[PDB]
Amino acid sequence: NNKNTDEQVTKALNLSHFVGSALVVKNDHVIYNRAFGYANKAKNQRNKVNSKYQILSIQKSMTAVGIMQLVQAGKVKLTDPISKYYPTLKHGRQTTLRQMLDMTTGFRLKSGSKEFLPENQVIDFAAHNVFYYPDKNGIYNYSSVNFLLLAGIIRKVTGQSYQHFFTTHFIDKLNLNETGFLIHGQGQDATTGYRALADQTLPNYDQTMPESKSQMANELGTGQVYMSTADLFTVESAILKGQLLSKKNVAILHTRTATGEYGGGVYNMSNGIRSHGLGYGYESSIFLSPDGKTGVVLMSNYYRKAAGIQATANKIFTELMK
């Protein structure tokens, strides 16, 4: 029952010290939709169901889909070497687009620019400053620069910005009204990130988390977007239902590797897909069934390592799936 569901999920969230918005869908029907704690404590603004949160690394699933759309259009191939798009790279030149999508490259960018740069200069800074580790080639190892460099390929091949691509193929395509780029401001129902102590569980809101324009620009392709929980579910479900990309091409994209569950910008699990993001005081979590009909989205503006939301979403999803 929805009464049962409401009591059980609210208890799980309360015991885990949840701050943010929670959405639970079963067989295409919303069965739980509630918010907890504060979007901004100093202004006495409560989080709401349609509050906007950082999707963080979950954005990489969307960058991946963009690449695979270009594959279907005949404009790139997953076998392409990175040097085809970045001809001044010194090392790792043989690395394929497939490996970039699967976090099986030896690339790592230690830091982005401290300056606020436009997209083309963010891309150039990465290509000039990335390190290459031959012993990490072909083995799962999480490295965000892979997806920033994928965002640069979208820009190069299309002749338009990544923001323009994202706006066209996600925001406009799916009529998203609670989604955008953090650099331009969140608008109504904005949230503020909070900084926690290592062992903190109870929220206290005594320290806000800054993010610079530089930090937001440097998350090109990788964690620069805000969404409501509804908008995030709409996107991920639309992917798996084959509304953005044929189901044949989703199947190609979303394939695990020999060394990891990660493939095509998501974790390919035993019972659907998972994506997790952390950064800037925020945490994001989605678990979704393979057919896109049943899942859980939690997003928080008050990340606490001692009260992580992914574990909570995992518990909810496991119960949901039986």
Author numbering: 72 to 393
According to the publication:
We show that lipoteichoic acids (LTAs) but not wall teichoic acids are D-alanylated in Lactiplantibacillus plantarumNC8 cell envelope and demonstrate that DltE is a D-Ala carboxyesterase removing D-Ala from LTA. (a) The dltE gene encodes for a 397 residues protein composed of a transmembrane segment predicted between residues 12 and 34 and a larger C-terminal extracellular region from residues 34–397 and named DltEextra. The domain consists of two subdomains, an α-β sandwich (residues 76–126 and 246–397) that form a five strand (β1–β5) antiparallel β-sheet flanked by 5 α-helices (α2, α9–α12) and an α-helix-rich region (residues 127–245) folding in 6 α-helices (α3-α8). DltE is structurally homologous to the D-Ala-D-Ala carboxypeptidase R61 (DDCP) from Streptomyces that exhibits the classical β-lactamase fold of PBPs.
The first motif is strictly conserved in DltE (128SIQK131) and located as for DDCP at the beginning of the α-helix-rich region (α3 helix in DltE, α2 in DDCP) at the interface with the β-sheet. The positions of the active site S-X-X-K motif (128SIQK131), containing the catalytic Ser128 and Lys131 residues, and the catalytic Tyr213 from the second motif are conserved. In contrast, several striking features distinguish DltE from DDCP and more generally from PBPs and DD-carboxypeptidases. The β3-strand that usually bears the third motif and defines one side of the catalytic cavity is not conserved in terms of length and position. The global architecture of the active site cavity of DltE is therefore reshaped and different from that of DDCP enzymes, adopting a deeper cleft topology largely opened on both sides of the protein.
